[PDB]
Amino acid sequence: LVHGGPCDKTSHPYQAALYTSGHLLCGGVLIHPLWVLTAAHCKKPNLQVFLGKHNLGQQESSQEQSSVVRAVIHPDYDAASHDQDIMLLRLARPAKLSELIQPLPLERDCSAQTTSCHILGWGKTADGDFPDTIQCAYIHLVSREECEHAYPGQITQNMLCAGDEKYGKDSCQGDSGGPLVCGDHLRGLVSWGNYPCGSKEKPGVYTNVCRYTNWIQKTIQA
């Protein structure tokens, strides 16, 4: 997460840390006591979901860990374009809910216009290093049109754009599948964007969570 600051330890109960081969691969959102939402490109062997995490370097009294029973990738994911970049992870055990582990409600209405949002994660920072402490950034919902010029012919009804004009706060490698929270509701998931990370000109591209209400429910109820 570029041009951000360390998060308030209490402001991210819904945050998931996805691990593979012993290193942080992705982010995720606890959306149900048994389910983590993430990006589909995060499908890597033997995923280990860590909930209630703040510092990845230290062991914490609030941390909980779980293996993945099932990883459900949207049937229409196109890895070349990131179209339908959504995955559902069935936790081995229903997560021990506390004040530091809580599900986050998803924004079902595609109409909703709370441009005032934020990103969070453990992706590579401005110094080029992976932070042990989770990074935050307040950002705004960038226009369909600006994305249509920043990214020529690479935006669909399944993608949302977000960024900050003044500082250029953006998501980066390691933040994949992390939440875009708007009005205390999940609006999107870190999918892709610009290199090097920075939303000055070219914003960050996110998965459009509202487009997947019926898919998520039909996968949770299966």
Ligand SMILES: *[B@]1([O])O[C]([C][N]C2=[C][C]=C(C([N])=[N])[C]=[C]2)[C]C2=[C][C]=[C][C]=C21
């Ligand atoms: B993952 O964490 O990172 C890459 C994609 N990285 C990325 C994310 C956001 C932005 C942005 N907003 N400018 C740019 C680049 C893909 C990936 C693949 C497998 C596992 C994890 C990731």
